[PDB]
Design a protein around this ligand. Sequence first.
Ligand SMILES: Cn1c(=O)c2c(ncn2C)n(C)c1=O
Lengths: 120, 117
Amino acid sequence: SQVQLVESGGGLVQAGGSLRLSCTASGRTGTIYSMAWFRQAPGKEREFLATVGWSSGITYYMDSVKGRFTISRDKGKNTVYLQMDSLKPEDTAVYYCTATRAYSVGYDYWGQGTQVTVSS
Amino acid sequence: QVQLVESGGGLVQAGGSLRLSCTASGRTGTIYSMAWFRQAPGKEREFLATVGWSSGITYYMDSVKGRFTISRDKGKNTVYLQMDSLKPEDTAVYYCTATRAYSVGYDYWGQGTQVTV
Ligand SMILES: Cn1c(=O)c2c(ncn2C)n(C)c1=O
């Protein structure tokens, strides 16, 4: 793979708590147009959550996470973040980061995910 | 600056097929890609598939890959979602979107069309 992604930052918290996910990209990172976070709860489909423009830092959020989660990136460190506040049990899932290449569409590169568990 | 109107859908028998379409009007030259989402009752909007407006390159989520086909006719300003091998859990309101060049996410949304399997 010309770009490799590794997510970290997951773990177990109680409801009301916070986590900060991160994902480092390596390889041909100059080809990245945007990065996005998804999550997959057990037995469910992958759900798109939020995206950030790699060059611009412009962001877009789905209503499921808007106003609790913040996506950002430190371009010089080739790292994207997902700040997750006011976590609820229903946020429990494997969280994946992805990259979309310039002149492509969709989600070209995927990490292996990081587990997020929110208990009562 | 861009308006989207979806057509197609309605009641369809399981195992069958439906083709949805969406026509864009306005500043269509600014469109980089278009994408279909769906929302089952009481659930979140789920991203399904996208097509590059200039190139026709496509991407599908695993939920629909190998069953739905997305395509576009640039001259007619129209994008299509061919839905084959439909299953009960495909019942949802289907929404088409457009993303402007140099934007991110989903800038323009249609009003949706119901598909009931
Ligand atoms: C919206 N958009 C663009 O506008 C774009 C792009 N790659 C190049 N451009 C211009 N990608 C991947 C993209 O999603």
